[PDB]
Each structure stands twice: as C-alpha cells, then as structure tokens.
Amino acid sequence: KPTKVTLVKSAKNEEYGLRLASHIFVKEISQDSLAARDGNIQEGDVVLKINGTVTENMSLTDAKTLIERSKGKLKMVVQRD
Amino acid sequence: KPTKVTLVKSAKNEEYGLRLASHIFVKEISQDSLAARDGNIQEGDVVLKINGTVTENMSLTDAKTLIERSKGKLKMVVQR
C-alpha cells in the first residue's frame, strides 16, 4: 500500500536530501510475439542496456530513438526484478 | 545474473511484442537530511506521484521541472 510524503524546506538553499533515478522495465510481453517465443525476457524485468547503451536515467523518448537506431535488430540486457 | 537478449525482426513493420515503462525510484537518501527526518520514505521506494502528478513514464528532467514549480514544498506518493 502507497505512502504520502510531505517535505517542507526551512531555507531557500536547503536540499531535500533525495537522489532520484529512473529505470525502464518490461511492462508487458505480447502473446506469441518475437519476445515471447524467444523466452529470455520476462514481465517485470528491468532493462539495464539497449544496444550497448545503459538505460538508467534515460527517458522513454530517448530509449525510443535508441531502439529505432538499429532497424530489424534489438539487443538488450535485462535483469529479473 | 543479468541476461543478454537479441531480437531480430523479419520486417520493419513487425513488432517485437514489448511494452516498456519507466519508474522513478529513491536511489539514496542523504544522512540526517530533511527527507530522512521528516519522512516515511526509504531507499528503493518507487515514486508513484509528485505534487499529484503520476510519475510513471516521466523523465527525470520533467520531474525536476515539476518539483521546482512548488518551491519549498514537496508532496510525494511512494511504494515499497
């Protein structure tokens, strides 16, 4: 179950003390798809790399261009979550 | 242990059959910081919302802009 958090600064230049980061994950695998028949990728997997590039902190939009680079071929590194 | 995968299409029109989403997570909390004191927030938590805006699929750069729109106050919804 979720949790609400409320942080209020005491001065303009005080930090929150928070280091945020993003990960791309495999949300859904289409039935009988290329990815499905291959067997190596599973739903929930986190994507460490796409076409040799690390995808941590990468926007979904930038990942799109990273995938579109290599027509017909997609390399990835995934990890069970 | 991380697994390597290579998918090869047979036409540029064909799909791989993959739906991807991004999630913003709490990577590290600074010792004795405002967040470590005034929060029930822990390292590894996923951020679901910032200032009422769902953060799923939001890039870090857009979250930065959203966080600064409310100078001084930060509201979040997180999950273990």
Partner: peptide, 9 residues
C-alpha cells in the same frame, strides 16, 4: 551507483 544524470534535490 552515483550517476551524473541522477536527480539530486
């Protein structure tokens, strides 16, 4: 792993 592109607030 601290990255330069992490969001520190």
């Amino acid at each position: 792993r601290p990255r330069p592109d992490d969001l520190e607030i």
